Amino acid sequence: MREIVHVQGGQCGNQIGAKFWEVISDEHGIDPTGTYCGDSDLQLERINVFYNEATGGRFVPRAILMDLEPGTMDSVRAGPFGQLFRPDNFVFGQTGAGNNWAKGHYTEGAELIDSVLDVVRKEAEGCDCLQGFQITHSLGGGTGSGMGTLLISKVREEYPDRIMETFSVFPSPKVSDTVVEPYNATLSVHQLVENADEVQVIDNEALYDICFRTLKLTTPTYGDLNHLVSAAMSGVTCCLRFPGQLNSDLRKLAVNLIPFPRLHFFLIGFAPLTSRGSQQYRALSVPELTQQMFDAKNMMCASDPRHGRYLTASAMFRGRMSTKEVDEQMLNVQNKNSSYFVEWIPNNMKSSVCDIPPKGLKMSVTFVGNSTAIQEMFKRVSDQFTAMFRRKAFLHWYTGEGMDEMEFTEAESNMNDLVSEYQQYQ
Amino acid sequence: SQPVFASPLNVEKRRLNEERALMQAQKANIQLPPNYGDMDLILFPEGSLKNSNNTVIPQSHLKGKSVALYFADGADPKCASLLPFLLNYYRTMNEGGANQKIEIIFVSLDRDREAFESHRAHMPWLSIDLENPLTEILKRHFRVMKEYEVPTYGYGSRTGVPSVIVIGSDGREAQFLPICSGLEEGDRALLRWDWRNTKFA
Amino acid sequence: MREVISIHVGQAGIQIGNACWELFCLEHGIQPDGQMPDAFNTFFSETGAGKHVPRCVFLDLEPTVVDEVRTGTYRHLFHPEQLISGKEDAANNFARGHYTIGKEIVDLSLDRIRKLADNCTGLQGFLMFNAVGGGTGSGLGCLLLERLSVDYGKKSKLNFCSWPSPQVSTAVVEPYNSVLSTHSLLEHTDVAVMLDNEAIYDICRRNLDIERPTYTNLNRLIAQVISSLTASLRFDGALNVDVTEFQTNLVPYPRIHFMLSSYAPIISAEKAYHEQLSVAEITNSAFEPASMMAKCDPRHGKYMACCLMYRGDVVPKDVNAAVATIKTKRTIQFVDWCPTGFKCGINYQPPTVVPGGDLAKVMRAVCMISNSTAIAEVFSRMDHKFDLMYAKRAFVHWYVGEGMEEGEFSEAREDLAALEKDYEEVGI
Amino acid sequence: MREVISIHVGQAGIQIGNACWELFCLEHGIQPDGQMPDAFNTFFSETGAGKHVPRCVFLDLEPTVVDEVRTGTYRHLFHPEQLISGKEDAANNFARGHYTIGKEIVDLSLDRIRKLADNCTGLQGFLMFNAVGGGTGSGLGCLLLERLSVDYGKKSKLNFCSWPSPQVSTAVVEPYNSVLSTHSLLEHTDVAVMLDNEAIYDICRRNLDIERPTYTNLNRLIAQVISSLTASLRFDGALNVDVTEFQTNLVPYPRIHFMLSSYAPIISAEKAYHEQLSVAEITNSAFEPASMMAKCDPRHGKYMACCLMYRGDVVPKDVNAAVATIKTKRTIQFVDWCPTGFKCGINYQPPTVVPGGDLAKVMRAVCMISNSTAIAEVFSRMDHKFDLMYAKRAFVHWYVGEGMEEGEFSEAREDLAALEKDYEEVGI
Amino acid sequence: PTLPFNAQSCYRSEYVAKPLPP
């Protein structure tokens, strides 16, 4: 049938991807030892989208765990639900790309690609024909931003007719780790706009805003934030695994969303997000789901969308919705928020119905919005890059690994063009 | 074999416990000779401790209280200095709660009976009589001595009289209070007492 | 597999690291025998059944500090080959530790370094402890570190330098010893962390509230920085770092790798219950200038890069709460060209306490290693100690007579002149 | 079955023989009486009521050592006329032990050897221990090779000669007896293993850490070496290698059969228990230049061939993995024309340690016998010693008066030079 | 001729057999 190949890169990627397989195993009901319990034929009528039979009845995930630092995915192995993953699917490293984009891509990476491309195509070619790829990584880091971006480039030229879509975190405005952010980000973007089909942006302090203002949780760890991202990843690809009224595919939302090939960077939403206290006030129904779609504090990325106009957007509703109150209100939010959307497209805002609600809730909706609010955010990284390029700050670590003075200027110009293309469309 | 090997309490402990260990091993996989962890001893015998009312109390009475030995001499000026502050600490710390917190045993480095009773009249905590062998055994156990009179086996003086030693159930030195030590907090070291984590179990 | 080989050279290196190793033994539950009744891979090998031998070498030209370990309570803990003693002491000369007596030890020591490094590929680095004003601390330190750079190409080299004080010196030859070390430290090491002495005196005066501690209490606090530094390798965390990423975290130019330290909380067990240590309060004590371990006033210093490793039960967002308010504060001045300047990693396991130590049991802790332009004070002061003492060739004949070429002191100063100017060039 | 005959000639022959016949008795668990309460056939015979007697002959022209063995602890084990003793010693004179006093007892030696070889079929080979520097070890040895090559032409002859050291020699007559015996053992001795006394002094001083050893401290190490070479015959293993196995694998040419020796691990009581004896580690320690048992630096030579005898809990993959590292190691040079020159002979049985001796119980061991072109220097030393003495006929009249002509000194000179030239041309 | 000296080094005093973590 249809296959989605999962690849996790970087420290960020393996930690996110650990909780993604938490929720996916929980959607279908696979016990962490690999056995199935949940006794429903419609749960796993489409099971082969993510997993494989093993003549013991166990399902192993089609995940390729991928890094250069042998400790971070050693963590994943010992953790809960770590015994799902195939031991052969691990591709260790020894040295570790120490936050240098240069050594992730060209020098240090190149001797490990001989292994990771082997394992990816052996799982690819095994089936009838592939559908897509998933890459979970960070574009601030070294081993995810650079060495993961190599794996983006090679599999694209090998399967040009397939799709792939990634979930990538970016530098945050106030807090910022990893002092080479804009070197790692800008070098990754100008490769990402050339060899990737779809990117979902995540901001760290936008996630922190969620767990303060909405969730009413004082001090949880990365576990809670990954849970929110894992729900969003499950929400986008729900429709491949379950039927519905208005069906969806990754490629069908691909053709629906992007107007021009250059701009394919997407915002994320999710609902419901009220606390334990506020649960009993709300009586969940179609209009209040849509109202907290268009709540700026509920946005997964902290680029304030009120400044820009939404170019287009999608809403994969999940549950048992009555379709008239779905689409009429879907039009209603376009008329109500008149200036919030763009003028030259009639029917800016879209819908789907994914017939199975997630367990523990009854109605859910995932927002994917191609906004122009990312104008200010890439302009943030643009100025941050120019600040440490005017006289070659931190340049020697990159330059020593086969970089050029010319290739840095191309990355600035190329990523600046992406800024220009968004600003033109207003 | 804590805090030293060559102490009379520990030689008695080792003798008794492995006597028992061999007997039950033969009567029955049990490791000989037994680990110091696995050994059990009765520290203060039946008629050792006697309180402020001149009444003997058993060892099981000391459960739930941070106990400390106090090696004191009647005629030593340092001990004469340290006594009021230890008494005041006992006072305030035990008054300030609805639970007994700490208890002091008196071990006498004193010369004779008269002086021992005279000095013991000032103390509101427990004591061990001077003619009782347990005094000399405890002195050799915790390596307190005013002068090199009794041989020490390659060790040194741990301290001098006066000293306060927070003890455990098995003769473990829980912590040393630095009165006259490497640190010299005279009259002030009593605040270093961690009474919460050293209870006589 | 992955590990770091530690080197101890000179007396200051030995007894600081002797505190550093006894902290690590109790961290992993290793008895002084070396047994245990995937933690210990990065500092220990495993020998036969149930053992743990360390990844270390002791070097000194005098027996007196190293043999005393050989007979100590850590008898069986160290393999008896990497403990190295010469015959006669280096005696406060750069020249003697570099030219005459230092040569006959490096020929055997580099062999043991080779013997320890040839087991597993992917060496993390080299943690070498030394003093700077000392004799064998510099001379033997230089000759070993120079040979290591050529022999082993690309791997990192951490160097904790017990830097001479701004105020006290405890030796007269310190300006001659310190300057000459630097000219042979710049192009060899990768991360040189500067540590002071009376800072820790001033720390133990205020925060620890103990009247009269000695070098044995200096070393506990030093050992607590190192443990928190390499906490990421040993234990899993919510957000971990590496020792090969620090050089990509901290240095903007290859010649600028002189960073400070900070640690919090540093509290007596007696005054501990008057502070429930929150993340809001520990971070501000980290940036407070009377808590750093280098003693240079940062008020005339523009911060450039900062790297905080949180320890213990700390969640990520109150870190993000703390760092939000930190950046907006105008008492902690960052330079213009570096608008992002924080790395903040997190590990799970809270810091251990030594029994009978001066550290209360804390639940969270912050360790800071930062690149700042305040080191222009540390060097411009030092240059003044040189030329005033080199005004009329004081103590020259000692260095001249031992082997050094007179006039080599000139380009050593011209080297340090360039290191003086580039800091001042950066800060504008 | 598979029997070998050990021949002991001279002081060094007898005293080495004491160590080996102590170890073989203990290993097969036979008593000083000679009865145990078929693996032992290789070294012992069978006689009626379960007594096993050794297959050895003791030759010394001097009574003071052979007689004193008969009276010692090992009375009933050896056959009384398997120990042959003469009247007066050869007294460091090659002419005496070869012409005058040698000839008397040669016939008595052949008769016992004849009766011990003809006991059964399948005689594997002869082993011989002798001192080259000595009188009878060189004198009686040359006669005994000459009269054994004629009779048992077929069988192999493995020699273990105690060669004089470069510095320390225990004789001024030793350059004469060295070069006069080399013309003997070129064309009679099949394979000679080259032993040096102060090499073993250096081994037992830094590895096993005895400051003041003796002859019975070196001879145990030789006994453990011989036991490792012949472990393959005695016990079952993964890869068995006989004595006929050695000639075809070490020597490429008829005249070139001079080779070194190495053992690993020579380890003490305290060292052994604290250490992983990796299969990688024991092999690396074997190829160390100083760890050879000859005092002959192999860095200025080329290894022609090499055999490794493993002994203990040794798995074959670790052997194959470790030796591939050795070949790709750049340090040791192998000859271009000989691409394959390694042996893997793995045995199961652990080395049987004599407690109250000097070695500890170790799980595994390797013993290396390597044919190298470093033998040039050890002949160049003896050659130049012989040239200085012979230049003005020192100590010549003692050799001439006993029957040896002047001219065997002349011809043996170029014979060593012919040997010297061949080792030069083979290193091309 | 001496009765015995019983002051002790700081190193010997305090880096002692701690109870082990498991």
PDB file of C-alpha atoms in Angstrom, chain A residues 314-398:
ATOM      1  CA  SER A 314      -5.829  24.172   6.069  1.00  0.00           C
ATOM      2  CA  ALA A 315      -7.823  22.633   8.914  1.00  0.00           C
ATOM      3  CA  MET A 316      -7.897  18.862   9.355  1.00  0.00           C
ATOM      4  CA  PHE A 317     -10.895  18.412  11.679  1.00  0.00           C
ATOM      5  CA  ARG A 318     -11.042  15.049  13.460  1.00  0.00           C
ATOM      6  CA  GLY A 319     -14.107  13.362  14.946  1.00  0.00           C
ATOM      7  CA  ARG A 320     -17.817  13.107  14.079  1.00  0.00           C
ATOM      8  CA  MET A 321     -18.647  16.586  12.766  1.00  0.00           C
ATOM      9  CA  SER A 322     -21.778  17.718  10.921  1.00  0.00           C
ATOM     10  CA  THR A 323     -20.361  19.072   7.706  1.00  0.00           C
ATOM     11  CA  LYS A 324     -22.669  22.086   7.211  1.00  0.00           C
ATOM     12  CA  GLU A 325     -21.625  23.729  10.470  1.00  0.00           C
ATOM     13  CA  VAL A 326     -18.079  22.757   9.482  1.00  0.00           C
ATOM     14  CA  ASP A 327     -17.878  24.553   6.135  1.00  0.00           C
ATOM     15  CA  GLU A 328     -20.317  27.412   6.754  1.00  0.00           C
ATOM     16  CA  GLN A 329     -18.345  28.559   9.812  1.00  0.00           C
ATOM     17  CA  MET A 330     -15.189  27.834   7.812  1.00  0.00           C
ATOM     18  CA  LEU A 331     -16.437  30.483   5.363  1.00  0.00           C
ATOM     19  CA  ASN A 332     -17.661  32.580   8.340  1.00  0.00           C
ATOM     20  CA  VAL A 333     -14.130  32.946   9.771  1.00  0.00           C
ATOM     21  CA  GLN A 334     -12.970  34.165   6.329  1.00  0.00           C
ATOM     22  CA  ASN A 335     -15.702  36.847   6.294  1.00  0.00           C
ATOM     23  CA  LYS A 336     -15.244  37.704  10.030  1.00  0.00           C
ATOM     24  CA  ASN A 337     -11.444  38.044   9.771  1.00  0.00           C
ATOM     25  CA  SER A 338     -11.585  39.990   6.487  1.00  0.00           C
ATOM     26  CA  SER A 339      -8.218  41.758   6.713  1.00  0.00           C
ATOM     27  CA  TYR A 340      -6.464  38.741   8.296  1.00  0.00           C
ATOM     28  CA  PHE A 341      -6.463  36.929   4.947  1.00  0.00           C
ATOM     29  CA  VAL A 342      -5.253  37.865   1.478  1.00  0.00           C
ATOM     30  CA  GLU A 343      -7.557  39.404  -1.108  1.00  0.00           C
ATOM     31  CA  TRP A 344      -6.475  37.846  -4.412  1.00  0.00           C
ATOM     32  CA  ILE A 345      -7.558  34.328  -3.429  1.00  0.00           C
ATOM     33  CA  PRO A 346     -11.303  33.637  -2.975  1.00  0.00           C
ATOM     34  CA  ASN A 347     -11.868  30.913  -0.351  1.00  0.00           C
ATOM     35  CA  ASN A 348      -8.584  31.343   1.519  1.00  0.00           C
ATOM     36  CA  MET A 349      -9.390  28.712   4.152  1.00  0.00           C
ATOM     37  CA  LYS A 350     -10.001  24.978   3.826  1.00  0.00           C
ATOM     38  CA  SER A 351     -11.268  21.906   5.633  1.00  0.00           C
ATOM     39  CA  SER A 352     -11.284  18.129   5.995  1.00  0.00           C
ATOM     40  CA  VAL A 353     -13.065  15.564   8.172  1.00  0.00           C
ATOM     41  CA  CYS A 354     -10.992  12.689   9.611  1.00  0.00           C
ATOM     42  CA  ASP A 355     -13.546  10.303  10.938  1.00  0.00           C
ATOM     43  CA  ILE A 356     -11.716   9.013  14.027  1.00  0.00           C
ATOM     44  CA  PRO A 357     -11.267  11.475  16.938  1.00  0.00           C
ATOM     45  CA  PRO A 358      -8.103  10.947  19.060  1.00  0.00           C
ATOM     46  CA  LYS A 359      -8.787   8.831  22.174  1.00  0.00           C
ATOM     47  CA  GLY A 360      -9.421  10.852  25.387  1.00  0.00           C
ATOM     48  CA  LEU A 361     -11.063  13.682  23.399  1.00  0.00           C
ATOM     49  CA  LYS A 362     -14.101  13.799  21.047  1.00  0.00           C
ATOM     50  CA  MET A 363     -13.313  16.598  18.603  1.00  0.00           C
ATOM     51  CA  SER A 364      -9.932  17.827  17.477  1.00  0.00           C
ATOM     52  CA  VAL A 365      -8.554  20.055  14.731  1.00  0.00           C
ATOM     53  CA  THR A 366      -5.019  20.678  13.458  1.00  0.00           C
ATOM     54  CA  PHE A 367      -4.147  23.986  11.814  1.00  0.00           C
ATOM     55  CA  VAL A 368      -1.613  24.314   9.006  1.00  0.00           C
ATOM     56  CA  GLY A 369      -1.293  27.889   7.794  1.00  0.00           C
ATOM     57  CA  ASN A 370       0.876  29.267   4.988  1.00  0.00           C
ATOM     58  CA  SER A 371       1.092  32.818   6.342  1.00  0.00           C
ATOM     59  CA  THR A 372       3.276  35.750   5.370  1.00  0.00           C
ATOM     60  CA  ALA A 373       4.037  36.410   9.076  1.00  0.00           C
ATOM     61  CA  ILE A 374       7.324  34.517   8.561  1.00  0.00           C
ATOM     62  CA  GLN A 375       8.508  37.757   6.863  1.00  0.00           C
ATOM     63  CA  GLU A 376       9.684  39.143  10.207  1.00  0.00           C
ATOM     64  CA  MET A 377      11.057  35.799  11.438  1.00  0.00           C
ATOM     65  CA  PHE A 378      13.425  35.124   8.524  1.00  0.00           C
ATOM     66  CA  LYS A 379      14.289  38.816   8.682  1.00  0.00           C
ATOM     67  CA  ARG A 380      15.349  38.116  12.320  1.00  0.00           C
ATOM     68  CA  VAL A 381      17.816  35.420  11.150  1.00  0.00           C
ATOM     69  CA  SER A 382      18.868  37.657   8.226  1.00  0.00           C
ATOM     70  CA  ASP A 383      20.012  40.439  10.548  1.00  0.00           C
ATOM     71  CA  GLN A 384      21.530  37.907  12.991  1.00  0.00           C
ATOM     72  CA  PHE A 385      23.555  36.425  10.117  1.00  0.00           C
ATOM     73  CA  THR A 386      24.799  39.816   8.918  1.00  0.00           C
ATOM     74  CA  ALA A 387      25.900  40.715  12.471  1.00  0.00           C
ATOM     75  CA  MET A 388      28.409  37.828  12.565  1.00  0.00           C
ATOM     76  CA  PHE A 389      29.473  38.005   8.919  1.00  0.00           C
ATOM     77  CA  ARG A 390      30.628  41.646   8.521  1.00  0.00           C
ATOM     78  CA  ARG A 391      34.130  40.625   9.605  1.00  0.00           C
ATOM     79  CA  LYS A 392      33.974  36.848   9.831  1.00  0.00           C
ATOM     80  CA  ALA A 393      32.984  35.934  13.382  1.00  0.00           C
ATOM     81  CA  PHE A 394      33.333  32.194  14.151  1.00  0.00           C
ATOM     82  CA  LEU A 395      34.149  31.580  10.476  1.00  0.00           C
ATOM     83  CA  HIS A 396      37.304  29.535  10.931  1.00  0.00           C
ATOM     84  CA  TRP A 397      35.538  26.326  12.117  1.00  0.00           C
ATOM     85  CA  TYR A 398      33.470  26.252   8.932  1.00  0.00           C
TER      86      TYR A 398
END
